[PDB]
Amino acid sequence: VTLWQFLLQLLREQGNGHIISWTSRDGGEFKLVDAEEVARLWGLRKNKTNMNYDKLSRALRYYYDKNIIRKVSGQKFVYKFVSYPE
Amino acid sequence: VTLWQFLLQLLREQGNGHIISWTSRDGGEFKLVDAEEVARLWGLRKNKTNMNYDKLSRALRYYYDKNIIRKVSGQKFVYKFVSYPE
DNA sequence: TGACCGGAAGTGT
DNA sequence: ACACTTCCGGTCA
DNA sequence: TGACCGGAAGTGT
DNA sequence: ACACTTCCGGTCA
């Protein structure tokens, strides 16, 4: 499972916005409300308990040149799926 | 992703027990608090909006002979992972 | 002074 | 081959 | 009278 | 080959 797919799953599956939330769903923009918790969970998808936001954020940065995800400048922990979140 | 893996993910990732919850964790027993919602989400993992509990429960029944999951008799919506999770 | 950035080497399939 | 993972030195507000 | 059960045929990789 | 998915007739409490 890829990081972007996982993020999409969390946004779809969480019952609330305590750890992740759409900021502007129309635009595919979302915020990692509890970045370290989202990272913990991401690491656990690979059976690791040590994933943190510094490493997950780097993975997201790796997406910039792939035109998969981009940063929403000026807003902390907010990112944007460039290809409509379907 | 398999149904049992998905269930394990929900139990690990949900911030509360509004749709799924461990009943006796060391025993690997859990309850589908909102069975139809858990089913909806399961279907969406495969890009389908029509998965319901009747079909998901059948998938779980298919697990009985595989010694992966068993029913916790006498309790509605409660099942048991036979192989230690966490 | 914390979030964000990107190079460079390593991991697991 | 590919999708990150792991470090981490440096920038920006 | 709803949750649970299991046969039998079909789907997608 | 495998892991369900889809129907659904019947049981149990």
Please spell the DSSP secondary structure of chain A, one letter per residue: --HHHHHHHHHHH-SSSSS-EEEEGGGTEEE-TTHHHHHHHHHHTTT-S---HHHHHHHHHHHHTTTSEEE-TTSTTEEEESS---
In Å, how far is B45's CA from the nearest CA of chain A?
8
| Nearest neighbour of B18 by CB, restricted to A15, A41, A44 | A15
For residues A10 and A35, give the distance between their C-alpha atoms in angstroms, rounded to a whole number. 12
Question: Is the CB of residue B12 less than 8 Å away from at least one CB of chain A?
Answer: yes
Range of the domain at B34: 1-86
Question: Is the CB of residue A18 less than 8 Å away from at least one CB of chain B?
Answer: yes
Experimental method: X-ray
Cα dihedral sign, A54-A55-A58-A63: negative
For residues A5 and A20, give the distance between their C-alpha atoms in angstroms, rounded to a whole number. 14
Overall resolution, Å: 2.1
For residues A72 and A79, give the distance between their C-alpha atoms in angstroms, rounded to a whole number. 5
Q: What is the CATH number of the domain that holds B50?
A: 1.10.10.10
For residues A11 and A69, give the distance between their C-alpha atoms in angstroms, rounded to a whole number. 15
By the 8 A CB rule, do A35 and A79 touch?
no
Tally of domains in chain A = 1
Residue A35's nearest nucleotide, by CA–C1', is: C3
- List all residues 6 or more positions away from B33 whose beta carbon is below 8 Å from its beta carbon: B17, B18, B19, B20, B21, B77
